Design a protein around this ligand. Structure first.
Ligand SMILES: NC(=O)C1=CN([C@@H]2O[C@H](COP(=O)(O)OP(=O)(O)OC[C@H]3O[C@@H](n4cnc5c(N)ncnc54)[C@H](OP(=O)(O)O)[C@@H]3O)[C@@H](O)[C@H]2O)C=CC1
Ligand SMILES: NC(=O)C1=CN([C@@H]2O[C@H](COP(=O)(O)OP(=O)(O)OC[C@H]3O[C@@H](n4cnc5c(N)ncnc54)[C@H](OP(=O)(O)O)[C@@H]3O)[C@@H](O)[C@H]2O)C=CC1
Ligand SMILES: CCCCCCc1nc(N)nc(N)c1-c1ccccc1
Ligand SMILES: CCCCCCc1nc(N)nc(N)c1-c1ccccc1
Ligand SMILES: O=c1ccn([C@H]2C[C@H](O)[C@@H](COP(=O)(O)O)O2)c(=O)[nH]1
Ligand SMILES: O=c1ccn([C@H]2C[C@H](O)[C@@H](COP(=O)(O)O)O2)c(=O)[nH]1
Lengths: 560, 560
């Protein structure tokens, strides 16, 4: 074969692709466009006498399409079938000018042999576009060099599934090969197709491309490209760049001289296009381990730190709940609702199964802070108290503080509702006069809001100290969620959460676990919907039952 | 010629290169390395049967070199002289088979012919390395495709100067006689060397490379590469990339259609390597103008804004006092000293010639803040009051507030001296309970400090609102100077200033003036020295006379 073969498919995390000879989900507008652009684009125009691509499909997929869309315009359509006749297809509807006559072939080898022989001068690329029968044939034959997979993050009822294939761990968690009961079921994919099924000819598909998350009709999804592999596997003029190179070389020495020293950490290095926004997070971990400085801290553990780091997360299609390790969403939600209430009683959290604060409000820890007058659970005048009562005198976690101090959150919302271009829409929890009264000095300590010219809301949060391993994914979810709630009660659309970080670190004893996490490819982000919107007029109206997380498919626990 | 010729030189902004047949400045270590690396660089190594480069020099430069460097090792040395004898040079040292005999030639064309003829197979590159007589011959001949110039930012006394040349405005501001004495005094540079001084054959030298600023022995300097140009131009694996291309093509479509419908602004786009840290600032201005959103601010005058921007400035070799427009240094230093004192009386600044607060402390402006009881000049419980007395109740600018509030600056200095790995070394001016008592709500509102494993101090400052045109360069200088001061009284070395920015904008009526500034190539940064260091033990001990700015050579005023 001289023509490239590719597979294009959209599937759920359990590989579901259809039901009752239709698609399983509501219409996915961006995926529809992607399918058209990929299958219609000549290879010459993408890099940026009639030549065109071919689409090969099974009989049921052909019949599954509305007669309006079939044949797929501007591509050569081949249908694999034993019953359908070419003349009937031509007689289905008038053949527009310049379109190719639809061919019917008895197998996939026959379809490809026809394309190689009869369309030698005219077909550039070949796309196998379904269904399960033809996908199975093309995988078992080994002819697909790349798979274009739209990863639909939600599960739907399905009765037709894409075949299990080597590389399908990109879709969902697999119970290892040391905890698997038996070798996982899978088509054999020949690396060299002419050598067929031989032990030394086993291929697998590895991702080279993972996009940011899209959504349509409440369905999150993204786009990946897998490449067939063996299982065992700045520009200027040529005068300008050559003149500059000796100077760059000596200026670049120190970076090189300490870079190749150790073997650098890198997250899933085979992924070339790193569109997924979670790559910011994975690359930050690698950056700290590779380039941070090790020092002892207050507890004496040993930290590796950098100073001054940033990430940004889009909020308009999906929600940045990180996927390479599960985020404790219930803790995020309950603790944010607690902050918003101005509540300083951590027992109200603990009693909901949210224990994140409890180690820091023990009688022991409070006494260590020289706070023996604090009841167990009382965090002092901390986060939510400064948000809603900044500067008020603090007595204990049971006191009614209504009307005392500055209500920054109310001021922020009122300013967004009346003068959104204002440049003072800030909320701070850093009160130096109160730090000695708190169980813990605040960590996420400042946030600022911004509205552009299209009613789109953004938030920045500044964090003085960030454990990237444990706390950072939680902090991202908290302030992203805060941005959704503020946006809804201010009649704005949530756009971007921006994370500014001071001392950004990982603990040395976590390094091995983090290296294992950095072998994981990120999954598409879930969608967070606000329920009962018509009932929720003010920030205090939200409750824990007013949220749903849709399509969250994180990796499982760490092997350590 | 089949072999390239380049000039390598270090000069002051007045083109001074030497005095008493020596160099004018103390030893510049990094420039010495640069010279060695560039002139010994095989073309092989840099971009990544013995071959070597040649260095061509005048008799006095040869005599100027210490015996240990005479001849320059691993390079073929050619001395242009009418009096030096090759045989006398060869008798000075053993003539080893591993090194090249020094050659003497009567002129530069003879030196170049010898190189092309007798060293056809062995010489890769030719470097003219001084002095003035050889540089003038090489420029007038037209044979140098590139100039490697070390821009020494200080004037030193010199008796030997590099010839005036087209492109020497890279060094300093040109007086009104820019086009006047240049044709009379500037060397004519042929573009095609064989066509001599024909009016059609005029060359000029343009920067393609501007590095960050270095320093040694109290001297700031940077590295530029200029390329010869005509005057009349002035006034992974292929399969992976091809598989990915169609997906990127449709993903980029919306942004592709915005870029080609806009005239995109770019600072000095002929500069390809943009190592100078001021490019962060010029790039930010361009990005705001290209990609910011226009809205009417408080005054309704027109502002273009982004949200969430960052820059970082090194403090270990030079000081980031921006060069494409002069910064009001005296204002920077006096206002910071005023902050540190906890002073809230702007009259103390105004009587020193620093008027920057005057418009915001007038009777009219205070009355508009509903502060009729404020005396003219009283900024309220603002920046330096919050630094030294956070939380204290304000009465007026005459009150003695000793011992009142939290002295954040003192706490930070004490923590840096006793426990520098602490992650709570912050200082904040954002007091939401005091904001209505201030003339202006603080702009630069939080700063955090950090010490690494090498006693090196860094500082982050968060600014909620940044007029990039008029406020940001001043702000950069204020907190960089603060970091120098803090590091000194804590026995630390200043490392880096990190600028975190919220609402980041330019006013629409400054755009044309800003475009003019974006045509300016940055100059090397100056050095800021602290004088009388042994007399200065505490942050309160600094006075205005304890600082000197060394080698500051900014561009002049803007026409627009
Ligand atoms: N989500 C997605 O990306 C896609 C979803 N789909 C969904 O998948 C389902 C249809 O796929 P499916 O149901 O598997 O049916 P197919 O589209 O695979 O067509 C099956 C028929 O094609 C012919 N055929 C298939 N494989 C072979 C083979 N190896 N050799 C010879 N002939 C072959 C036979 O035709 P005959 O019996 O006439 O000989 C067979 O009955 C529908 O629900 C559809 O909506 C379809 C495409 C992509
Ligand atoms: N900062 C820098 O980058 C450098 C600085 N320097 C400084 O520059 C000074 C020396 O430079 P300079 O004083 O200009 O003297 P040169 O090094 O240029 O040597 C001058 C001598 O070289 C010969 N010569 C020079 N030009 C020609 C020509 N066009 N044709 C023929 N012979 C020529 C003559 O030698 P004869 O009289 O024997 O015929 C002339 O007297 C020193 O102070 C040195 O330290 C030097 C190099 C680099
Ligand atoms: C008729 C065109 C629908 C295009 C959107 C659905 C789709 N998406 C992807 N990524 N791959 C596919 N193969 C298909 C598809 C193509 C043909 C029929 C059914 C589904
Ligand atoms: C003995 C070599 C000293 C190298 C440092 C001084 C220097 N810097 C630059 N950028 N260009 C130059 N041509 C020279 C130079 C080379 C030889 C003699 C004097 C100055
Ligand atoms: O919301 C939070 C709270 C805490 N931490 C981590 C960062 C530090 O490792 C530790 C806080 O201790 P100090 O910075 O105060 O030393 O907890 C977070 O990452 N996010
Ligand atoms: O240190 C400062 C102080 C002020 N500004 C600018 C930013 C704003 O354009 C203006 C203050 O206006 P508001 O953001 O407060 O509206 O002054 C600065 O850039 N730096």
């Amino acid at each position: 074969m001289q023509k490239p073969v590719c597979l294009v498919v959209a599937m759920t995390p359990k590989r579901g692709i259809g039901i009752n000879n239709g698609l399983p989900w509501p219409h996915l507008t961006t995926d529809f466009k992607h399918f058209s652009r990929v299958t219609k684009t000549t290879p010459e125009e993408a890099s940026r006498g009639k030549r065109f691509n071919a689409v090969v499909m099974g009989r049921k997929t052909w019949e599954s399409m509305p007669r309006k869309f079939r044949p797929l315009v501007d591509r050569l359509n081949i249908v694999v079938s034993s019953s359908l006749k070419e003349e009937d297809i031509a007689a289905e509807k008038p053949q527009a000018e310049g379109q190719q006559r639809v061919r019917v072939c008895a197998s996939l080898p026959a379809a490809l042999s026809l394309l190689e022989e009869e369309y030698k001068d005219s077909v550039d690329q070949i796309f196998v576009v379904g269904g399960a029968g033809l996908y199975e044939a093309a995988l078992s034959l080994g002819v697909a060099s790349h798979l274009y997979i739209t990863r639909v993050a939600r599960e739907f009822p399905c009765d037709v599934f894409f075949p299990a294939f080597p590389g399908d761990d990109i879709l969902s968690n697999k119970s290892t090969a040391a905890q698997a009961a038996a070798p996982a079921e899978s088509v054999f994919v020949p690396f060299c197709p002419e050598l067929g099924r031989e032990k030394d000819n086993e291929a697998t598909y590895r991702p080279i491309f993972i996009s940011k998350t899209f959504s349509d009709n409440g369905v999150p999804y993204d786009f990946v490209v897998l490449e067939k592999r063996r299982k065992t596997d700045g520009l200027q003029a040529p005068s300008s760049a050559a003149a500059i190179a000796p100077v760059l070389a000596w200026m670049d020495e120190e970076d090189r001289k300490k870079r190749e020293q150790k073997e650098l950490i890198r997250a899933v290095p085979h992924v070339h296009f790193r569109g997924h926004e979670e790559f910011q997070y994975l690359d930050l971990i690698a950056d700290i381990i590779n380039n941070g400085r090790t020092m002892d801290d207050r507890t004496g553990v040993g930290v590796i730190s950098k100073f001054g780091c940033t990430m940004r997360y889009s909020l308009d299609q999906a929600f940045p709940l990180l996927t390479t390790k599960r985020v404790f969403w219930k803790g995020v939600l309950e603790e944010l609702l607690w902050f918003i209430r101005g509540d300083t009683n951590a027992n109200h959290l603990s009693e909901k199964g949210v224990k994140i604060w409890d180690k820091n409000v023990t009688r022991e820890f409070l006494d260590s802070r020289n706070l023996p007058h604090r009841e167990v659970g009382d965090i002092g005048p901390g986060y939510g108290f400064q948000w809603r009562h900044f500067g008020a005198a603090y007595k204990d976690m049971h006191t009614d503080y209504t009307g005392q101090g500055v209500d920054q959150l109310k001021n922020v919302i009122q300013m967004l509702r009346t003068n959104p271009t204002d440049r003072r829409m800030l909320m701070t929890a850093w009160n130096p006069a109160a730090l000695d009264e708190m169980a813990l000095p605040p960590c996420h300590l400042l946030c600022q809001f911004y509205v552009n010219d299209q009613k789109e809301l953004s938030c920045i949060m500044y964090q003085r100290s960030c454990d990237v391993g444990l706390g950072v994914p939680f902090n991202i979810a908290s302030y992203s969620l805060l941005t959704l709630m503020v946006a809804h009660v201010c009649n704005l659309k949530p756009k971007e959460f921006i994370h500014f970080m001071g001392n950004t670190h990982v603990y040395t004893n976590h390094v091995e676990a983090l290296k294992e996490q950095l072998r994981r490819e990120p999954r598409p982000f879930p969608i967070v919907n606000i329920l009962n919107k018509e009932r929720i007029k003010e920030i205090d109206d939200f409750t824990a039952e007013d949220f749903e997380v849709v399509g969250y498919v994180p990796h499982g626990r760490i092997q350590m």
